[PDB]
Design a protein around this ligand. Structure first.
Ligand SMILES: Nc1ncnc2c1ncn2[C@@H]1O[C@H](COP(=O)(O)OP(=O)(O)O)[C@@H](O)[C@H]1O
Ligand SMILES: [Ca+2]
Lengths: 68, 464, 375, 68
């Protein structure tokens, strides 16, 4: 029974390190993507603010054209 | 009542002394200034005097009701909302206010600015505070407790500094919600002691997926601003409702007698009749209560007493009595009725106030007690207004608000985020699920008003 | 009692049986519409098998079960088993008897006349139900979303309905019924999977396809442009360790099956995409009624939850269509449950009385009370 | 020695369960963020085209106004 207990200890201790290792890498991968996600989100908002103006200017030009 | 109860009683005459000291006290909590009345209670109250198996008094409890809804954000220039707020601003030192990002000036805020007014010519809040503090200590609210109470209001104020800088993410029609003023938004989450991020994601984006096993959240998509501002208010309205209830109930914990036990004798007290320069949805519900109140008397001093004659073995005959006017009641209770059709017009999110008003003129203007500018040829009725006959006098109302003001619906998603709080204060505003008021839960707060008043009359028609 | 009557809100289809308590907003009780037997023979004594296994009880332990499907998008293969499907709704989940509270169901437009009386008979003339009604699928979502003027395309799983409702009902039609949604995609995957040593044959595993589907499957922005991009192994191949024991790096299997939607040619039908029929239905209406339809499009159902479904529509339509009004597609937070958000409404309304059928009303007009009241 | 090994195995499996749980929540968090990032990326590209179109149509309107 001792041999079995030692055997399970080996595979458990090893899998424990792998599980912890994966937890760090997964968190590492989450961080690098989270940062990029925030940068994109911010960039998207800014562009859409310009998208508003771009249209209002285009419409204003059309209304200004109708007058002339 | 006293003296008739055989005079002496240490625990009995004690209330006779404290209830006299209640005059400078009661005026602080459940009272506000109306242009017609200064000491006007802004909530239905049904006091209950307790007694023993002899006839002497021992104590009593208090029961409130749904109470006006839009008095927290909307009102005419000159009136106020609730004392508890104003008594705070001019109470705490400027030092403590600055720490909470506050200032002794309502105009500086937003929620309070949407009200219209701030300063009152008849009331002196600055000089009243230090006088109230003595009354605060009279009951048993020491500075330690005072500070604990000011936090709850500070939380409300932090919610009041949170609006939505109409996110211009969408280019045309619909629009998302984004908070540029993160300072103010963060201040709330900081004092609420919750994740600022989760708070913004869970609220701005509602979650739904409760398949008995019990929910999997986060799936959502942005919505218009009107709904955002609407859901926002519903949060600030449901928080105060459950606050006032839990607040006054915890005050009695120090006052309410625990030494004795026995039966109960009831006493009623409610707001009275009023007429302003311009009437609105508010007057409709208030005047509606009077119609229910008039029915109360008729049901009791006119109807119940008659049934007592034929029950006490007396040769009585049914004498002509003016109409039982049960039509003005059935017209707003059972299917096919006023507030029965209104409920139908509410949930139809697009059916605005104007459309609902149209459903009244057509479905009715045939049943007694209703007129307008279309049917009744009378210029006195504006095209944007309508006539409504009461038991005698005539009143013209406006259709402003009505729906969004009455609905006040707040489902889980938004509430759930607050119920799962670790702070003892926040979760305190969300008691352990329905306290002696279960039935069904989701069905607007407007329809819940009717239920609160119906539950009131039911227990009025079962006593002497 | 007092100010409480309690009304159930149900909405069954070919994917889920949505149900709740009373006055709810979102569906509380949900379970798959399945009912099979034991091909295996129950151990027979370790329970006189019976209970086909249903509700969150059958789906939990599939394998052993011989899941048979009664409601294939519209047509019901057999009504006898339906009795034991509704025996799970009110009783097991809701824990309330149908001989107490009303009931609300959904109506798939243009449903067989024989089905109207058949359904009603199961309740009134057997399982006493004081009152009930069968509202029309799409119309419900309109009000809840808060739209008065829209063109609705409600498609959950059963069938597709192009309903240009934006003011009233019962006009010529401008509506269509197509058998190309949900379950149709579930059966198509196993077909193509055979080209990669995969073959989910029977129903038990066919359900697993649905699971794997709603976690990765997507719709290509543009099949033609993403063809050359297939060379890249970053945006296409996506690992998915099957929770049973199999790794399937789906890449071109995610946007090949959903393509059937826009390409009915992959299921042997002359019918065109859902953007051609859209024109077909709009053109049969007034001429001064279109400008507002394009302005606001209502796309509800779980089919609109897929990534890359709304943006594509704004690319193909604008190409060959009136180009004057703003083009905008409305996709509510949970556009799938939009039906249940509106379903709960009508159930909680009082004006609803002058529409439904009451106990006595049935005996007063016989079994034809249905088509005599509703339509 | 068996008793000592069993004791070490008990706590080992407990740490293993905790490690795997942490990794399961981490890999899921990375998955949902990655999905959101892709959704934002596509929304950024599709609008990047609109922004340009909104700018060009404005410049064209200006040129059209100059002619008249
Ligand atoms: N987020 C989602 N993305 C894609 N498909 C989804 C999503 N959520 C649910 N579904 C799918 O939608 C279908 C259920 O939609 P539903 O409208 O309830 O159908 P029905 O009413 O025909 O039963 C199922 O196939 C389910 O996998
Ligand atoms: Ca659907």
């Amino acid at each position: 029974e001792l041999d079995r207990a030692q055997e399970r200890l080996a595979t458990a201790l090893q899998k424990l390190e792998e599980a912890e290792k994966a937890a760090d890498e997964s968190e590492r991968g989450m961080k690098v993507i989270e940062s990029r996600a925030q940068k994109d989100e911010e960039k998207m908002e800014i562009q859409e603010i310009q998208l508003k103006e771009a249209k209002h200017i285009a419409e204003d030009a059309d209304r200004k054209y109708e007058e002339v | 009542l006293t003296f008739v109860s055989s005079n002496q009683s240490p625990n009995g005459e004690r209330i006779s002394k404290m209830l006299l000291d209640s005059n400078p006290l009661l005026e602080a909590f459940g009272n506000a200034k109306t242009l017609r009345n200064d000491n006007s209670s802004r909530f239905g109250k049904y006091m209950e005097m307790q007694f023993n198996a002899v006839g002497s008094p021992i104590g009593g409890k208090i029961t409130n009701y749904l109470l006006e809804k839009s008095r927290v954000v909307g009102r005419t220039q000159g009136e106020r909302s609730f004392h508890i707020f104003y008594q705070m601003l001019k109470g705490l030192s400027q030092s403590k206010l600055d720490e909470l990002g506050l200032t002794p000036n309502a105009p500086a805020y937003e929620y309070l600015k949407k009200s219209g007014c701030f300063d009152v010519s008849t009331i002196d809040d600055s000089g009243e505070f230090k006088i109230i503090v003595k009354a605060m200590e009279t009951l048993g609210l020491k500075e330690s407790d005072q500070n604990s109470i000011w936090r709850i209001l500070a939380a409300i104020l932090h919610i009041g500094n949170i609006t939505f800088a109409e996110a211009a993410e969408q280019r045309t029609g619909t629009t998302t919600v984004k908070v540029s003023d993160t300072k103010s938004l963060a201040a709330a989450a900081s004092c609420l002691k919750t994740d600022q991020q989760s708070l913004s994601i869970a609220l701005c984006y509602r979650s739904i997926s409760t398949g008995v096993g019990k929910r999997c959240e986060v799936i959502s998509v942005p919505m218009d601003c009107n709904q955002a501002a609407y859901s926002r208010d519903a949060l600030a309205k449901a928080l105060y409702e459950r606050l006032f209830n839990w607040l006054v109930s915890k005050i009695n914990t120090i006052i309410n007698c625990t030494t004795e036990k026995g039966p109960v004798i009831g006493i009623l007290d409610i707001y009275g009749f009023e007429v302003f320069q311009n009437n609105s949805f508010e007057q409709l519900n208030i005047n509606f209560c009077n119609e229910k109140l008039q029915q109360l008397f008729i049901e009791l001093t006119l109807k119940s007493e008659q049934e007592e004659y034929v029950r006490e073995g007396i040769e009585w005959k049914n004498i002509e009595y003016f109409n039982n006017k049960p039509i003005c009641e059935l017209i707003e209770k059972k299917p096919i009725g006023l507030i029965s059709l209104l409920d139908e017009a509410c949930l139809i999110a697009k059916s605005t106030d104007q459309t609902f008003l149209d459903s009244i003129c057509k479905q009715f203007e045939k049943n007694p007690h209703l007129q307008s500018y279309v049917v009744s040829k009378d210029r006195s009725i504006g095209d944007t207004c309508f006539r409504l006959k009461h038991y005698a006098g005539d009143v013209t109302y406006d259709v402003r608000g009505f729906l969004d003001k009455n609905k006040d619906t707040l489902f889980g998603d938004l509430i759930s985020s607050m119920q799962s709080s670790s702070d003892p204060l926040v979760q305190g505003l969300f008691p352990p699920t329905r306290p002696e008021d279960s039935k069904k839960r989701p069905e607007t707060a407007g329809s819940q008003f009717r239920n609160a008043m119906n539950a009131l009359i039911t227990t009025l028609l079962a006593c002497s | 009692d007092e100010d409480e009557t309690t009304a159930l809100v149900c909405d069954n289809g070919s994917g889920l049986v949505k149900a709740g308590f009373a006055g709810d907003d979102a569906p509380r009780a949900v379970f798959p519409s399945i009912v099979g037997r034991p091909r295996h023979q129950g151990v027979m004594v370790g329970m006189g098998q019976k209970d086909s296994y249903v509700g969150d009880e059958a789906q939990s332990k599939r394998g052993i079960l011989t899941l048979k499907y009664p409601i294939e998008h519209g047509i019901i293969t057999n009504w006898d088993d339906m009795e034991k499907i509704w025996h799970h709704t009110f009783y097991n989940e809701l824990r309330v008897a149908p001989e107490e509270h009303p009931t609300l169901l959904t109506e798939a437009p243009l449903n067989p006349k024989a089905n109207r009386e058949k359904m009603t008979q199961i309740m009134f003339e057997t399982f006493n139900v004081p009152a009930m009604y069968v509202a029309i699928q799409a119309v419900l979502s309109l009000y809840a979303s808060g739209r008065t003027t829209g063109i609705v395309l409600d498609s959950g799983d059963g069938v597709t309905h192009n309903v240009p409702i934006y003011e009233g009902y019962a006009l010529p039609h401008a509506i269509m019924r197509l058998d190309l949604a949900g379950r149709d995609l579930t059966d198509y995957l196993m077909k193509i999977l055979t080209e990669r040593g995969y073959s989910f044959v029977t129903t038990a595993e066919r359900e697993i396809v649905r699971d794997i589907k709603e976690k990765l499957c997507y719709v290509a922005l543009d099949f033609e442009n993403e063809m050359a991009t297939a060379a890249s192994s970053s945006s296409l191949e996506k690992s998915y360790e099957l929770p049973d024991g199999q790794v399937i790096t789906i890449g071109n299997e995610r946007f090949r099956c959903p393509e059937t939607l826009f390409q009915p040619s992959f299921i042997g039908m002359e019918s065109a995409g859902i953007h051609e029929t859209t024109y077909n239905s709009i053109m049969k209406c007034d001429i001064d009624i279109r400008k507002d339809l394009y302005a606001n499009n209502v796309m509800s159902g779980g089919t609109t939850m897929y990534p890359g479904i709304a943006d594509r529509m704004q690319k193909e339509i604008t190409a060959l269509a009136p180009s004057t009004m703003k083009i905008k597609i409305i996709a509510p937070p949970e556009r799938k449950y939009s039906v249940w958000i509106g379903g709960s409404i009508l159930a909680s309304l009082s004006t609803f009385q002058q529409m439904w059928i009451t106990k006595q009303e049935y005996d007063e007009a016989g079994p034809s009370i249905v088509h005599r009241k509703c339509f």
